[PDB]
Amino acid sequence: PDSFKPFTPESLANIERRIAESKLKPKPNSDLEAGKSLPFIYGDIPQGLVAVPLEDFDPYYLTQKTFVVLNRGKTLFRFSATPALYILSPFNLIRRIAIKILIHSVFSMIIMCTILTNCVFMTFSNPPDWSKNVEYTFTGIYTFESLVKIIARGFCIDGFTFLRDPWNWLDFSVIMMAYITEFVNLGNVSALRTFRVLRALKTISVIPGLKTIVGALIQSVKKLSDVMILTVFCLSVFALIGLQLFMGNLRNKCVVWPINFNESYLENGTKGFDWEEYINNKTNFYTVPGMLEPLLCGNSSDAGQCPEGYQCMKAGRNPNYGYTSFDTFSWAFLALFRLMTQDYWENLYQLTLRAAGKTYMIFFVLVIFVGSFYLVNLILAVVAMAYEEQNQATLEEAEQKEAEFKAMLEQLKKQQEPYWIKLKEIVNLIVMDPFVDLAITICIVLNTLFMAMEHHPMTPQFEHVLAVGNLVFTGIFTAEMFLKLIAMDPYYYFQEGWNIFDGFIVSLSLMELSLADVEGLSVLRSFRLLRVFKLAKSWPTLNMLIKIIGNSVGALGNLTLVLAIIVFIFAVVGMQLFGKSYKECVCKINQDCELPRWHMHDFFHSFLIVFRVLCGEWIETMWDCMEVAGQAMCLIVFMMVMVIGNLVVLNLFLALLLSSFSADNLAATDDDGEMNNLQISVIRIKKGCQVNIEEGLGKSWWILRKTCFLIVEHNWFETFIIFMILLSSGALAFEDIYIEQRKTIRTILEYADKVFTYIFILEMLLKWTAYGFVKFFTNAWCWLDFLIVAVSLVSLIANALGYSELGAIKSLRTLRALRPLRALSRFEGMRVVVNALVGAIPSIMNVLLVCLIFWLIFSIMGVNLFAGKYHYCFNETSEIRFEIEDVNNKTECEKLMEGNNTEIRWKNVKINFDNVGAGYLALLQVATFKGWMDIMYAAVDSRKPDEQPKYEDNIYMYIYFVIFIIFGSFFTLNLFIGVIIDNFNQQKKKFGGQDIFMTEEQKKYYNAMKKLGSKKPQKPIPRPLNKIQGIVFDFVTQQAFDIVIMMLICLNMVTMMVETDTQSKQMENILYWINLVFVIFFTCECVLKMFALRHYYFTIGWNIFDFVVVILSIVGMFLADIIEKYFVSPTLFRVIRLARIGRILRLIKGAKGIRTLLFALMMSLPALFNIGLLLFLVMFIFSIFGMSNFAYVKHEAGIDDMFNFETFGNSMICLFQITTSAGWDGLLLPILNRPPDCSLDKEHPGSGFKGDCGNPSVGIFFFVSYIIISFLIVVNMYIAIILENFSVATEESA
Amino acid sequence: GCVEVDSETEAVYGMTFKILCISCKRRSETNAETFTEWTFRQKGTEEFVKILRYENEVLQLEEDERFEGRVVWNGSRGTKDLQDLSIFITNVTYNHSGDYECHVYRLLFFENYEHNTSVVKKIHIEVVDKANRDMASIVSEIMMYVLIVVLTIWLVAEMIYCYKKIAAATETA
Ligand SMILES: *[C@@H]1O[C@H](CO)[C@@H](O[C@@H]2O[C@H](CO)[C@@H](O[C@@H]3O[C@H](CO[C@H]4O[C@H](CO[C@H]5O[C@H](CO)[C@@H](O)[C@H](O)[C@@H]5O[C@H]5O[C@H](CO)[C@@H](O)[C@H](O)[C@@H]5O)[C@@H](O)[C@H](O[C@H]5O[C@H](CO)[C@@H](O)[C@H](O)[C@@H]5O)[C@@H]4O)[C@@H](O)[C@H](O[C@H]4O[C@H](CO)[C@@H](O)[C@H](O)[C@@H]4O[C@H]4O[C@H](CO)[C@@H](O)[C@H](O)[C@@H]4O)[C@@H]3O)[C@H](O)[C@H]2NC(C)=O)[C@H](O)[C@H]1NC(C)=O
Ligand SMILES: COCC(CCO[C@H]1CC[C@@]2(C)C(=CC[C@H]3[C@@H]4C[C@@H]5O[C@]6(CC[C@@H](C)CO6)[C@@H](C)[C@@H]5[C@@]4(C)CC[C@@H]32)C1)COC
Ligand SMILES: CC(C)CCC[C@@H](C)[C@H]1CC[C@H]2[C@@H]3CC=C4C[C@@H](OC(=O)CCC(=O)O)CC[C@]4(C)[C@H]3CC[C@]12C
Ligand SMILES: CC(C)CCC[C@@H](C)[C@H]1CC[C@H]2[C@@H]3CC=C4C[C@@H](OC(=O)CCC(=O)O)CC[C@]4(C)[C@H]3CC[C@]12C
Ligand SMILES: *[C@@H]1O[C@H](CO)[C@@H](O)[C@H](O)[C@H]1NC(C)=O
Ligand SMILES: *[C@@H]1O[C@H](CO)[C@@H](O)[C@H](O)[C@H]1NC(C)=O
């Protein structure tokens, strides 16, 4: 150690002599390497020997050309010993000064400052007159550093020099571009500005620690090799299925069928019918009034319909500018990538269901279950184990360094041998008491409850009370702080944590007290609620949330910085690329030729679009961007953004989850060693019949009870009870609005209800005599059954007595939907999931408390910002909103409402921040990203209470919706996931089992499949011993034969993507010939494997799969050709021809990368089956409720003639759509209608019900409860499948 | 928001009735102008005769000694867009036992389009002195009683069997 020496020419002489001796006749130490801090054992730099030409301090470099420099920051630099460019000698005093500059932190600080101001200048949209010079010096600065580097080292000539690190390539390229387009007139600004953003990537090279984070991200994504292949394979096969099924069933439009031949005008004149133009004419369509795209339809019975005089045909162009389509393999792949990431998939769902029928919903189930629920979780699990490995490796390096510290310590220890104080203490006396702290906490809670009491329609009496309460509470808090600041020290003892926070809060409160209310007070009164976090010292879960939030801005800060830089770079790239196109082609997308709500003309809107596509909504902006800037560039940029940003966000989520796990605790502080003063405060407050059975009748009674128990336990009564339960539950499906058409079914069900309730009453009585009163009443299942049968008894005996029209009886009739809530205690699969959820429920309640109190702060923030500003005057006749020039406020709209002008209405947005209660619903809509569009559209138009909104008058309110998503929808999810994982881990620890959602009957099959998965293969093959001669036996066992068959299958797959809806007949004939050739080749293959190998056709199972797919191929190829005689069945050949994609599954044969993934899916199938059964039961119950309640609401927004609640099928479809939480806002707006909109009395032809209004309370409660239950069930499904994936991926054996 | 139902064939003598003629359009959101006519052919007679005509929210009743004073409109009200064309008769006699044809004429107004639609609904009305309960109710009643009693006897028989078996086993040991 302690080796220091100037790089004198004799040092180079000996280095060259050593290398010459070595040549005439090995890993550098990772601790030393380069660009890191020096180990402590070498000491410190002597005097001013910093930036001196030291030599290399490690082996393996004694003979090679090297030269070492150090800085005052103690970092290692290794430049070359030879003069750079053979002209600049090291001792000629040109390179020495430049190296001294390069090793100075001030140089890096200056470069960072110029980089930040450069990107800030790139933020500006319009280049001002005083900007060119600002750019000029920037270039003059940048080349500066390059020159220094050029002086520092040569251009990749030999050894560790410039143009070796990729960042050297990056900045070399950026300066080359800058000086290419500096003074040269060549270069289009729209092409050079988008490349000018490359200076922002220099932040990673400048900011310390960013390069390691980027490398970690790339290493994490490195393992995504086989999962990507499986994802693309599944997407391809499902896209082939969709293309073969829905080929052209998206341009189906209803045109006026009766052709007015006498009035069929033409553009050139001379009349004429001119087909292929009569169908491309827009005016000969049907568009529902108030809508934009013409209505779709189908020729099937369950598909859509159009009015009289119209008829369906394939006409016009596909919906959504022709982008949403299934006519081509590329468009099908796009539309199914739209389904794997569930973004606006409800629109495609509705479009295909309307244009092809309601019986195709099964397809949309499969793609949801596999391809959108399994692939995403596969990717998440892969990233999770990658991050686990990275975290483990980092821990190993850390503990290795700490262990070498022990050896270093051993070595060093071996080598060692005016009455101010009176009032100070007096004001202190009222500090160290539990009472004052408890009073402070109670004051904070009461302040929160008082702030939650404000609403838009408030009377002066209420606001006076609120104002005086706010004044007194501010006074109390400022008195507490004021007393605290004198007790310890007027200018000291205020930096021990939580004493600067409350000081900041109280100072803001006092500043708010002054300055009156000129401007900005609405947001100013929104920073005091942070006193809620003062409860974190007593709330462990709130403290954990605070720790999670602080981890992002803290130890895990470089990841957040990288995410911010990535978002900014993508925003500026998009803004510079498509900024001008949105104005040139403004009404290519918006008929008014005014810029739409989501454009890319300025930096703020581009950043909003980037944040939106990060949230998950990207197709809607992609279509608009495509319509103005082409498809290629827009697709490339949107794909890149949605991949990279999502990957970074996922990595940050996983990192925060890992930091929240117990690895954060290192026993630095004692586990709750301190004592909570509340206990001592409470202590000091306190200080100052029974007959026998062994008789003639008792024995008989005992046998009676024992036989009742035996009847209960007999597994023939239970099956009959389950069958009766299924029949009773299914009898509730025939209660749609079409019940008047089927009178006989109604009568039969009405009379069978009596039999069902008698059966259940007898079962309850026999169970009572069997189990006993205490055993029957000491469990939840029998109590629930008793409640159900008791409500049935009430609804039966009351109805028999009378009062069938009573409000109470009618409101108890709809409670009959709880009859399906009786198979939970019978099916073990449902019961195990239900009881696991019940056992875990305390943790979700504890975290829901924190989530609610956190969301209350944001709800109060919104209420104090958007109270009563959502009202707007509306003209129903023209369905347009009045501008600020027509009407200004409510008074002007009222004046416009004079006389009989009922068309003018002072309408209000249904979802608004008028109070905390509605603010909670608005926050729920925003957090789930469903229905938030209208909320932020109305928020940015708001000006002040009681005045008509102006288009984009409060554009900077979007930030309020961004921050919430960062805090209420991102970190709260981290808390929920962490607590769920911890609770499930503890449940597994205490149970001692292997799986939670599995019954004991499924565990044996689980273990059997586990043994099957690890089974080794054997290949015993005998000779045919016949006239086969074994030549074909050796042929089939040839790898070339398998390669040929695989390549032929791949060619079949490739030629199965060329089919197009608008293809010519010649192309159809060519494709038919090619498919026939492939089919006959496959039949020849089957013949070859036939009659040459038979004794192995019941063991492997692949051969029988080929045999069962081939026969389907011949039938679907030639029988389908035959069926045209005496049979039509138009839709059946497509289903049969779907079997052709079976041969595509033969690529799984050699798929060892993804075969294990498919095996993991098989392994996790039953645990998913139990949860799916429970979800289906919940869906059935909520569907019965929806039929009973919302079967007559007005057809508006998501409620239409095809997706609504009258029939069981329609309700089932709507609830399955809501299960993924897709567009539940659209199905909630019609319920929220009011008598001004919906008629209280309305004739319903065919039924006795009157009116088309709904109960807002019932609808809100229904949808919220369904959302909560579906979220819990889907979370459990994700946890189960991810655990099974980890278990499968954590296995390895010889 | 419509269910096409069918009127009841049997009509009791001496009391009121309701002849249903419901014909709603294929799409509810559309608007139209609709008016109806009714033709009645008594049994034995072979010619349909117009009895009433509803249009412009008014009802015209032709001269017919069997129908004046004993028929009122009972369809959709308050609009020209008619989907319920039912009529209410306040006194059923033996004359009102024949075949009714409900001719509904609808004119649908689209944008630069007007479509003419005519629908004919056929109703058979039988006049009886007393109302006979439908066979479905009787069959359902008998079946529900039969299943109730057979289930009761099966349950008590199984209970008796198990009672005897368990009592014998207990007495044996
Ligand atoms: C769901 O189910 C729905 C159930 O119906 C289904 O609806 C059907 O859709 C299909 C297509 O989707 C429809 O089939 C098309 O119908 C078009 C209508 O054509 C009608 O009028 C034609 C012209 O009429 C003139 O000539 C007749 C005979 O000479 C006279 O009767 C007319 O009076 C008239 O005479 C003259 O006077 C006119 C003015 O008075 C004057 O302008 C005119 O020029 C002339 O001098 C008729 O020819 C045609 O009749 C033909 O077809 C019917 C069956 O519909 C049969 O009777 C015979 O086949 C008869 O020849 C109709 O009455 C057709 O135009 C259209 O055909 C054209 O396009 C196809 C390809 O799409 C071409 O292959 C073909 O050549 C046709 O000619 C035109 O195009 C070609 C190039 O494409 C061009 O070279 C040529 O010059 C010409 O312009 C096609 O058959 C069908 O009608 C719909 N309904 C029915 C009735 O089934 C719906 O699709 C389903 N929807 C989905 C997807 O779910
Ligand atoms: C030794 O091995 C121990 C290990 C124990 C933990 O196993 C797994 C439990 C589930 C858990 C915590 C794991 C990995 C990724 C986690 C997911 C990342 C996704 O991030 C989100 C957030 C929202 C989107 C950004 C992406 O999806 C979540 C929905 C998803 C997530 C939080 C659901 C829960 C997952 C680990 C296995 O034990 C058998
Ligand atoms: C008017 C109606 C709505 C009243 C019904 C309310 C129910 C929701 C409550 C009332 C009584 C409760 C029960 C009271 C006692 C118990 C026993 C408890 O288990 C024990 O105490 C264990 C006893 C043992 O095994 O020693 C489980 C919950 C349960 C069934 C409770 C479940 C919920 C019940 C049925
Ligand atoms: C697990 C979660 C869902 C529990 C927390 C639910 C609360 C946030 C909800 C449940 C009941 C709601 C209340 C139900 C009814 C009303 C009356 C309502 O009074 C009106 O006249 C409504 C006016 C309007 O429609 O804006 C004001 C909201 C309020 C207090 C609601 C405020 C929000 C409450 C307390
Ligand atoms: C179309 O109109 C032009 C101009 O009137 C005429 O020259 C031409 O012949 C017409 N073609 C047809 C289809 O008659
Ligand atoms: C109505 O009933 C009478 C009963 O005799 C019958 O002659 C004829 O059908 C009708 N006559 C009148 C009064 O319209």
| Residue A987 CA, distance from chain mean position | 27
Cα distance between residue A297 and residue A253, in whole Å: 6
Are A1243 and A341 within 8 A, CB to CB? no
Cα distance between residue A251 and residue A321, in whole Å: 11
Q: What is the largest CA-CA distance in chain B?
A: 95
Rg of chain B on CA atoms, in Å = 27
Residue that the structure tokens 């079946």 belong to: B143
B6 contacts in A (CB within 8 Å)?
741
CA–CA–CA angle A968, A969, A972 (5° rounding): 70
Tokens linked to B131: 């109302």
Tell me which of A249, A273, A301, A318 to substitute to probe ligand 1's pocket, judged by most ligand atoms within 8 Å of the beta carbon: A273
Whether B162 sits inside 8 A of A707 (CB atoms) is: yes
A residues 1201..1220 contacting B (CB < 8 A): 1201
Tokens linked to A151: 């002086």
Domain co-membership, A1169 together with A1279: yes
Burial A980-1019 (b: 16+ CB within 10 A, else e): bbebbeeeeeeeeeebbbbbeebeeebeeeeeeeeeeeee
- Ligand 6 pocket, residues with Cβ under 6 angstroms: B 65-66, 93, 95
Give SS3 for A873: strand
Chain A residue with CA closest to B81: the answer is A1243
| Residue A938 CA, distance from chain mean position | 25
Residue A67 pairs in a beta bridge with: A79
Residue that the structure tokens 């909504």 belong to: A617
Are A940 and A957 within 8 A, CB to CB? yes
| Protein residue with its CA nearest to atom 18 in ligand 2 | A380
DSSP string, A313-331: EE-S--TTTTTS--SSHHH
Give the one of B3, B22, B143 whose C-beta lies nearest to A738's C-beta. Answer: B3
How many of the other CB atoms lie within 10 Å of CB of A929?
A: 16
A residues 762..781 contacting B (CB < 8 A): 762, 766
- Ligand 5 pocket, residues with Cβ under 6 angstroms: A 268-270, 272
Are A439 and A445 within 8 A, CB to CB? no
Domain co-membership, A846 together with A967: yes
Burial class (CB in 10 A: 0-12, 13-18, 19+), B33: middle
Q: C-alpha distances in angstroms, A611 versus A37, A595, A1010, A1126?
A: 38, 19, 44, 58
Residue A923's closest CA among A854, A836, A869, A999?
Answer: A854
Domain co-membership, A36 together with A89: yes
Residue A585 within any structural domain of the chain: yes
CA–centroid distance, A276 to ligand 1, in Å, is: 10
Whether A711 sits inside 8 A of B158 (CB atoms) is: yes
For residue B159, the distance in angstroms to the closest alpha carbon of chain A comes to: 7
CATH code of the domain in which A585 resides: 1.10.287.70
Cα distance between residue B102 and residue A460, in whole Å: 63
For residue A1128, the distance in angstroms to the closest alpha carbon of chain B comes to: 26
Q: What is the DSSP letter of A332?
A: H
DSSP string, B64-101: -TTTTTS-EE-S--SSS---B--EE-SS--SSS-EEEE
Tell me which of B66, B68, B96 to substitute to probe ligand 6's pocket, judged by most ligand atoms within 8 Å of the beta carbon: B66
For residue A1057, the distance in angstroms to the closest alpha carbon of chain B comes to: 38
Q: How many residues does chain A have?
A: 1294
List the end-to-end C-alpha distance of chain B, in Å, as a whole number.
71
H/E stretch holding A811 reads: helix A807-813
Whether B27 sits inside 8 A of A306 (CB atoms) is: yes
Backbone angles phi, psi at A286, to 5 degrees: -130, 115
B167 contacts in A (CB within 8 Å)?
700, 703
- Give the torsion sign (CA, A892, A893, A897, A903): positive
Domain co-membership, A711 together with A642: no
Helices (H), A207-252: 210-222, 226-245
Tokens linked to A431: 């500090």
How many of the other CB atoms lie within 10 Å of CB of A278?
A: 16
Q: How many residues does chain B have?
A: 173
Tokens linked to A199: 């200076």
Residue A1009 within any structural domain of the chain: no
Cα distance between residue A989 and residue A926, in whole Å: 37
Burial A504-518 (b: 16+ CB within 10 A, else e): ebbeebeebeeeeee
| Residue A372 CA, distance from chain mean position | 12
Chain A residue with CA closest to B148: the answer is A755
Q: Which ligand is nearest to the CA of A913?
A: 4
Whether A307 sits inside 8 A of B108 (CB atoms) is: yes
Residue A324 within any structural domain of the chain: no
Cα distance between residue A82 and residue B173, in whole Å: 108
Q: In this structure, which amino acid lies at residue A534?
A: K
- Give the torsion sign (CA, A1050, A1054, A1057, A1059): negative
B162 contacts in A (CB within 8 Å)?
707, 710-711
B145 contacts in A (CB within 8 Å)?
none
Domain co-membership, A446 together with A564: no
Which runs of E-coded beta strand occur in A537-677?
Answer: none
| Protein residue with its CA nearest to atom 3 in ligand 5 | A268
B117 contacts in A (CB within 8 Å)?
308
Are A820 and A795 within 8 A, CB to CB? no
Give SS3 for B58: strand
Cα distance between residue A964 and residue A959, in whole Å: 9
Are A314 and A251 within 8 A, CB to CB? yes
Cα distance between residue B30 and residue B1, in whole Å: 12
Interface contact A1192, partner B, CB < 8 A: yes
DSSP string, A1216-1228: HHHHTT-STTTTT
- Give the torsion sign (CA, A1152, A1156, A1161, A1162): positive
Residue that the structure tokens 């709130």 belong to: A542
Domain co-membership, A780 together with A887: no
- Indicate whether residue A915 lines ligand 4 (CB < 6 A): yes
Residue A429's closest CA among A502, A478, A487?
Answer: A487
Cα distance between residue A857 and residue A855, in whole Å: 5
Total domain count, chain A: 8
Cα distance between residue A201 and residue A205, in whole Å: 7
Q: C-alpha distances in angstroms, A893 versus A448, A874, A1044?
A: 36, 9, 78
Q: C-alpha distances in angstroms, B104 versus A869, A1246, B62, B64, B113?
A: 50, 17, 17, 21, 20
DSSP string, A492-547: SS--SSSTTHHHHHHHHHHHHHSSTTSSSHHHHTTSGGGGGGGGGGT-HHHHHHHH
- Contact partners, residue A521, CB within 8 Å, separation at least 6: A512, A515
Are A1209 and A1253 within 8 A, CB to CB? no
Whether B29 sits inside 8 A of A1252 (CB atoms) is: no
Give SS3 for A126: coil
For residue A704, the distance in angstroms to the closest alpha carbon of chain B comes to: 6
Are A815 and A791 within 8 A, CB to CB? yes
Torsion from C-alpha of A1264, A1265, A1267, A1269, nearest 10 degrees: 160
H/E stretch holding A939 reads: helix A932-941
Are A871 and A890 within 8 A, CB to CB? yes
Give SS3 for A256: strand
Helices A374-416 and A226-245 sit at what angle, rounded to 10 degrees?
170
Whether B134 sits inside 8 A of A308 (CB atoms) is: no
Cα distance between residue A812 and residue A84, in whole Å: 92
H/E stretch holding B33 reads: strand B32-42
Helices A226-245 and A361-369 sit at what angle, rounded to 10 degrees?
180
Whether B3 sits inside 8 A of A755 (CB atoms) is: no
Q: What is the DSSP letter of A969?
A: I
CATH code of the domain in which A498 resides: 1.20.120.350
A1196 is in an annotated binding site: no
Are A386 and A223 within 8 A, CB to CB? yes
Residue A918's closest CA among A958, A870, A863, A848?
Answer: A863
Give SS3 for A1187: helix
Helices A916-927 and A932-941 sit at what angle, rounded to 10 degrees?
120
| Protein residue with its CA nearest to atom 11 in ligand 4 | A917
Residue where a domain stops, chosen among A1149, A1182, A1201: A1149
Residue that the structure tokens 């990717």 belong to: A379
Q: C-alpha distances in angstroms, A864 versus A425, A477, A861, A868?
A: 42, 21, 5, 10
CA–CA–CA angle A37, A41, A45 (5° rounding): 65
For residue A811, the distance in angstroms to the closest alpha carbon of chain B comes to: 23
How many of the other CB atoms lie within 10 Å of CB of B143?
A: 14
Residue that the structure tokens 């002054």 belong to: A514
Torsion from C-alpha of A895, A898, A901, A902, nearest 10 degrees: 80
Whether A1245 sits inside 8 A of B166 (CB atoms) is: no
Cα distance between residue A216 and residue A209, in whole Å: 11
**Whole domain around residue A588: which residue ranges?**
557-664
Whether B110 sits inside 8 A of A307 (CB atoms) is: yes
Mutate to test the interface with A, among B25, B27, B111 (most CBs of A within 10 A): B27
Whether A1195 sits inside 8 A of B5 (CB atoms) is: no
Cα distance between residue A478 and residue A513, in whole Å: 12
Q: In this structure, which amino acid lies at residue A183?
A: F
Q: C-alpha distances in angstroms, B55 versus A15, A192, B84, B85?
A: 114, 73, 13, 11
Q: In this structure, which amino acid lies at residue A796?
A: L
Side-chain-facing half-sphere of A750: CA atoms under 13 Å:
14
Domain co-membership, A754 together with A793: yes
Tokens linked to B34: 């609709």
A267 is in an annotated binding site: no
For residue B1, the distance in angstroms to the closest alpha carbon of chain A comes to: 6
Residue A705's closest CA among A617, A783, A772?
Answer: A772
Burial class (CB in 10 A: 0-12, 13-18, 19+), A956: exposed
Give SS3 for A439: helix
Residue A1078 within any structural domain of the chain: no
Domain co-membership, A64 together with A199: yes
Side-chain-facing half-sphere of A680: CA atoms under 13 Å:
9
Cα distance between residue A1092 and residue A1026, in whole Å: 9
SS3 content of chain B, % helix, strand, coil (to 5): 20, 35, 45
Cα distance between residue A51 and residue A1144, in whole Å: 65
Binding-site residues on chain B for chain A (CB distance < 8 A): 1-6, 22, 24-30, 76-78, 83-84, 106, 108, 110, 112-113, 115, 117, 134, 136-137, 140-141, 143-144, 147-148, 151-152, 155, 158-159, 162-163, 166-167, 170
Helices (H), A992-1118: 1000-1013, 1031-1036, 1039-1055, 1065-1089, 1102-1114
Are A620 and A344 within 8 A, CB to CB? yes
Residue where a domain stops, chosen among A908, A937, A965: A908
- Contact partners, residue A1277, CB within 8 Å, separation at least 6: A373, A1168, A1171, A1172
Cα distance between residue B80 and residue B31, in whole Å: 9
Residue A337's closest CA among A324, A319, A327, A350?
Answer: A324
Residue A549's closest CA among A965, A850, A862, A975?
Answer: A975
A695 is in an annotated binding site: no
Cα distance between residue B19 and residue B75, in whole Å: 10
Interface contact A467, partner B, CB < 8 A: no
For residue B12, the distance in angstroms to the closest alpha carbon of chain A comes to: 19
Whether A751 sits inside 8 A of B140 (CB atoms) is: yes
CA–centroid distance, A192 to ligand 6, in Å, is: 98
H/E stretch holding B106 reads: strand B98-110
Cα distance between residue B93 and residue B70, in whole Å: 10
- The coordinates were experimentally obtained by cryo-EM
Backbone angles phi, psi at A607, to 5 degrees: -65, -40
Domain co-membership, A718 together with A812: yes
Give SS3 for A79: strand
Domain co-membership, A850 together with A987: yes
Q: In this structure, which amino acid lies at residue A567?
A: V
Chains A, B: CB pairs < 8 Å: 110
Residue A616 within any structural domain of the chain: yes
- Contact partners, residue A751, CB within 8 Å, separation at least 6: B137, B140, B141, B143, B144
Q: In this structure, which amino acid lies at residue A693?
A: I
List the end-to-end C-alpha distance of chain A, in Å, as a whole number.
47
Whether B30 sits inside 8 A of A307 (CB atoms) is: yes
- Contact partners, residue A999, CB within 8 Å, separation at least 6: A828, A829, A832, A1170
Cα distance between residue A217 and residue A211, in whole Å: 10
Are A384 and A327 within 8 A, CB to CB? no
Give SS3 for B49: strand
Domain co-membership, A904 together with A938: no
Q: In this structure, which amino acid lies at residue A1270?
A: S
B78 contacts in A (CB within 8 Å)?
1243
Tokens linked to B15: 């009391």
CA–CA–CA angle A514, A520, A525 (5° rounding): 65
Domain co-membership, A923 together with A1025: no
Domain map (residue ranges) of chain B: 1-173
Q: What is the DSSP letter of A1097?
A: S
Q: C-alpha distances in angstroms, A1099 versus A647, A1017, A1019, A1108?
A: 43, 12, 12, 15
